[PDB]
Amino acid sequence: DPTPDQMEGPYFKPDSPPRTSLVTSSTPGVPLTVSGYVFGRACKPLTGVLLDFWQADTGGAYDMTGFAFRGHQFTGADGSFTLRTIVPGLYPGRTRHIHVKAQAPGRPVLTTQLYFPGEPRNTTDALFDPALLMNVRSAGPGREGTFDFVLDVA
Ligand SMILES: [Cl-]
Ligand SMILES: [Fe+3]
Numbered sequence: 719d720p721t722p723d724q725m726e727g728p729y730f731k732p733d734s735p736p737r738t739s740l741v742t743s744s745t746p747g748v749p750l751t752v753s754g755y756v757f758g759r760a761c762k763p764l765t766g767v768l769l770d771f772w773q774a775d776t777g778g779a780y781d782m783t784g785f786a787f788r789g790h791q792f793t794g795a796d797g798s799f800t801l802r803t804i805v806p807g808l809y810p811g812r813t814r815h816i817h818v819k820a821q822a823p824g825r826p827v828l829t830t831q832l833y834f835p836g837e838p839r840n841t842t843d844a845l846f847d848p849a850l851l852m853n854v855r856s857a858g859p860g861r862e863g864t865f866d867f868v869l870d871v872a
Contacts, residue, residue: 749860763797
């Protein structure tokens with residue numbers, strides 16, 4: 719079933735730098751890598767799909783002046799994507815989430831959000847959707863997330 723679309727929210731910024739790492743070795747926060755595939759119709763892993771991510775910092779704050787915690791990549795030849803970041807903090811009124819825009823070559827933009835398992839605000843945030851839940855395990859110093867996007871596209 720194709721990845722549901724959700725609100726952009728207040729804090730998107732166009733023209734994000736191309737980067738698969740949103741942090742450095744001095745960024746505050748609990749380490750988090752989100753990786754997975756983008757599939758199209760009929761389980762075809764999709765190549766060259768744009769993935770533009772953005773999230774709050776460890777304290778729950780979005781960077782409107784710069785491009786902190788903003789960065790986009792393109793899925794590899796085998797369909798995989800990889801995002802190195804830290805766990806975002808709770809912005810007031812929202813459950814923990816990371817935003818993403820996904821765009822297959824020449825198709826319209828999918829704007830959506832990824833959620834974390836076992837967040838208490840999942841009971842109360844109306845935007846929370848199980849289809850958008852990442853799988854998260856505790857690898858090493860920080861946490862590893864996985865999610866597959868499914869795009870209605872051949
Ligand atoms: Cl949950
Ligand atoms: Fe947000």
